[PDB]
Ligand binder design. Structure first.
Ligand SMILES: N=C1N[C@H]2[C@H](COC(N)=O)NC(=N)N3CCC[C@]23N1
Ligand SMILES: N=C1N[C@H]2[C@H](COC(N)=O)NC(=N)N3CCC[C@]23N1
Ligand SMILES: N=C1N[C@H]2[C@H](COC(N)=O)NC(=N)N3CCC[C@]23N1
Ligand code: FES
Ligand code: FES
Ligand code: FES
Ligand SMILES: [Cl-]
Ligand SMILES: [Cl-]
Ligand SMILES: [Cl-]
Ligand SMILES: [Cl-]
Ligand SMILES: [Fe+3]
Ligand SMILES: [Fe+3]
Ligand SMILES: [Fe+3]
Lengths: 324, 311, 320
């Protein structure tokens, strides 16, 4: 696994907690590793996140089953406890299993209804999300988007604001109001922050004044973005998380929170989906698929300030995976 | 071919005789070599097994036609006799074909209703199957199974008895009778033999060579034997076939075949998912005593010098 | 593009002009390079051929739109003029695009109703085609044929003459007339020429055929039978080392009503060849030496000369 240590020792989302019911077995991929996630049948059981590989004969444990608080390999029925230790070999039921019969386990935390995994030793905290515990804000989750592009391209595109009047034409501007005001970007001890920024939206409802939004966002780590939007009657926040499948593939998910009417959920999710799929069309075709750090090399203009700072930040962090 | 010499000089099943009719052209793939099988229209004509490659311009001979005891390439019509010598170049009908105009031919034998092929020099005869000569036993053939796993993984899985109660629950074991008694396994000059052992019915098997297995199962009222043959397509792909014989009622045939198909499909589900796809010889695999037969098999392949399809 | 320099500096066909309508955007692939072809909405606007690549963030320009004689990238709306210089950055509409905001453009010429492209610097003219301005000749074009074989294999198979009786039986021969007369073949500074020879059909049942390649992927073929003459220009697009596009421009001085019969005969013969070409191993064309891979008998004289000519030119792309 060629991921840089700075990536291995971070937290990434691999699933939503609501898709991982008691007694379930789920698969995911993170930084090139196959993972199995499983839970015992008890209510509120913790989630285990292991490499999807039985030490006996290399069969995926995800093809087995959960029984009596153990994951059971389908091939010879070896049973692994929550710590990943083999505690029973059915062929020799009075034999202590070899101390080497042990799954490779990883760190797992549930936070914000999401399943966070660290494949290494977590040097960092899970990013913060201040509105999570605020009862004035409702919450919803997008579907997960599988995207054939580097996770760092996915985050680069989400930090770029100048493309709004073109590929989000009709939602976030139009081709003839495309000028980009000066941008305020900082890379410091809190990571990358984009200062408050006006976005002219296209009018949809002519009875109402132009719902002009003001955005700002912070990245405390390069594959997770906290975004704040103020409209005329409402504040919307989201936690955008990118799962780095490998160097060339990503999963994109949003946790969205807003303090307007709960009835807005359907419209919020449909509007995110329309924006994300427009982005995915560009991401899928971008050349090369990995993000070039500072084919001709990419040109930069003043409105690229944000994405330029992002690329510099990645070089400072020693990122070599998913970039070129 | 780049398979090890020990594998090159052994016999492998590549087809059923019933599929090689007089006049026919069929193909197979063995140890990375594409093969053409063909027969003249004479009744009882022999089967030729050649590399599927016309040496003029590299077109598959299997796209050709069998005319007058010759195989005819479709591109320029060069005609090859039963020994694979080019005997006619139509562009120059008076010319004697040069000596290099020769198909690459291989050894072929029909035995037990199957087409056996040796790509090198057969130093063995075809493995024995005693019940073929016993008219008290009926016979049937499974269909062939194309498996995306190393052939040595396929054979390794078939000798590993401890998985029976877990993935063959109902035909070869009970999840409540999963304990495995002391296995007796012996690797000889006669190959690998597993001693008689009880299945919850007594079973034993012998492999005279790494990819052919003879297996014998005795119930209270009936004996069943089969010859299990693995075609090594290449390092990562196999064809599996069984010749099954039994001395019980002949009406049991469809049940027997159903049982085999169910057991094979359960095995394929596991084989397809196993990693790596090639059989590791001796993270690494762990061994408990009920791995006795599978460890002995891996040691045998290592002793034999097998490097194709392994590790 | 790891293509040899002698390939990069030659001309190749990448489209028919009828495929490139005013205002259109189409794509092509040449020697590993992805191409965008586009035209203004004006009638008889010139054709631009560029690398399919926006220099800003690497989006294919082929996903854009033609507007006001410019190609507009869809990502951030930069506009490139017919020379491929960026003329407008909409985020900074009063700013002058940096000099580096320039598409990678290629040489393009329309000739014989075909779009010719040179990725490097042209050292030759587009091949000559004498009958193009003869008003006694009608013209027609085949469709384009994508072939999963090296373009040198495609060209090799079309100068092979001894296979006509076998895979083209009923159109270019039959198995009762499979014997090949002596072949006149000359390779020199001006390419490969095959002298007149007799093709059997259904004096007698025959045509006389010759052909010439001034360059290794373009062939001029001439066939005469009973006062009617057919010529064609066969052009192979080298997509990469393992893939190609085949096109024909056909001209003939007989009845106009032969057009659809000519097209069907060409199509049948081409599909018969593709069946062979897709089965051949290796995919790339094997050159000559310093179970045999290849054997050569006297009727192979023209394909042997072709292989020798390719080594002499220094071709390593698409051969082996
Ligand atoms: N994390 C992010 N959520 C999005 C919010 C929600 O609005 C929509 N429609 O997605 N709006 C917005 N302008 N930013 C900048 C890029 C897209 C996004 N980034
Ligand atoms: N050569 C072999 N044939 C197969 C048959 C399957 O039996 C039934 N009843 O389907 N019998 C048997 N004991 N096994 C163990 C593994 C697979 C197999 N080995
Ligand atoms: N340049 C060439 N065009 C093709 C046409 C095919 O003729 C017809 N009637 O379809 N004519 C011809 N002599 N040949 C032989 C090789 C393929 C081809 N070479
Ligand atoms: S492979 Fe998992 S128990 Fe044997
Ligand atoms: S390739 Fe077989 S005869 Fe020419
Ligand atoms: S990528 Fe083409 S304008 Fe930005
Ligand atoms: Cl449980
Ligand atoms: Cl995608
Ligand atoms: Cl015959
Ligand atoms: Cl499979
Ligand atoms: Fe976007
Ligand atoms: Fe099994
Ligand atoms: Fe042909």
């Amino acid at each position: 696994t060629t991921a840089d240590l700075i990536l291995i020792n971070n937290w990434y989302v691999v699933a939503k907690v609501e898709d991982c019911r008691p007694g379930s077995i789920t698969t995911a991929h993170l930084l090139g590793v196959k993972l199995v996630l499983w839970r015992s049948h008890e209510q509120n059981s913790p989630i285990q996140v292991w490499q999807d590989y039985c030490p006996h004969r290399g069969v995926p444990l995800s093809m087995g089953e959960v029984a009596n608080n153990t994951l059971v390999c389908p091939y010879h029925g070896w049973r692994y406890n929550q710590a990943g230790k083999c505690v029973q070999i059915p062929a020799h039921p009075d034999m202590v299993p070899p101390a080497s019969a042990q799954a490779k386990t990883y760190h797992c935390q549930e936070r914000y209804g999401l399943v966070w995994v660290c494949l290494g030793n977590p040097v960092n905290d899970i990013p913060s999300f201040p509105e999570w515990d605020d009862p004035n804000y409702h919450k919803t989750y997008t579907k997960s988007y599988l995207i054939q592009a580097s996770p760092f391209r996915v985050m680069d595109n989400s930090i770029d604001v100048s493309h709004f009047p073109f590929i989000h034409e009709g939602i976030l501007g139009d081709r003839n109001h495309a000028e980009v005001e000066d941008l305020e970007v900082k890379v410091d001890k809190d990571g990358l922050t984009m200062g408050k920024y006006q976005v002219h939206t296209s009018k949809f409802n002519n009875s109402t004044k132009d719902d002009s939004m003001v955005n700002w966002f912070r990245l405390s780590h390069p594959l997770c973005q906290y975004c704040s939007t103020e409209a005329s009657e409402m504040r919307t926040v989201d936690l955008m998380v990118v799962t780095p499948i490998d160097e060339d593939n990503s999963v994109l998910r949003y946790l969205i929170m807003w303090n307007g009417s709960k009835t807005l959920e359907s419209k919020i999710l449909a509007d995110y989906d329309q924006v994300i799929e427009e982005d995915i069309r560009i991401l899928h075709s971008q050349q090369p698929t990995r993000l070039p750090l500072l084919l001709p090399q990419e040109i930069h203009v003043p409105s690229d300030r944000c994405t330029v700072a992002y690329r510099r930040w990645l070089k400072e962090l020693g990122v070599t995976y998913g970039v070129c």
